[PDB]
Amino acid sequence: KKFACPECPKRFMRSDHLSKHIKTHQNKK
Ligand SMILES: [Zn+2]
């Protein structure tokens, strides 16, 4: 529900710091 790294079952309260986190899930490529 809401926004949150769809890759890992975590929880966040924003889209900025939340996006930067998912940025490490797709290193390069
Ligand atoms: Zn994640």
| Torsion sign, CA atoms 10, 24, 19, 7 | negative
Alpha-helical runs (H) found in the chain:
16-23
Amino acid identity of residue 29, one-letter, is K
Q: Give the method used.
A: NMR
Distance 17 CA to ligand 1 centre (A): 11
Residues counted in the chain: 29
Assess contact for 4 and 12: CB atoms under 8 A. yes
For residue 6, give the DSSP letter.
T
Task: Report the alpha-carbon distance of residue 15 to residue 18 in Å, rounded.
Answer: 5
Assess contact for 10 and 4: CB atoms under 8 A. yes
Task: Report the alpha-carbon distance of residue 23 to residue 2 in Å, rounded.
Answer: 18
Distance 10 CA to ligand 1 centre (A): 7
Domain layout of the chain by residue ranges: 1-29
Task: Report the alpha-carbon distance of residue 22 to residue 24 in Å, rounded.
Answer: 5
| Torsion sign, CA atoms 7, 11, 14, 16 | negative
Distance 23 CA to ligand 1 centre (A): 8
Task: Report the alpha-carbon distance of residue 24 to residue 28 in Å, rounded.
Answer: 9
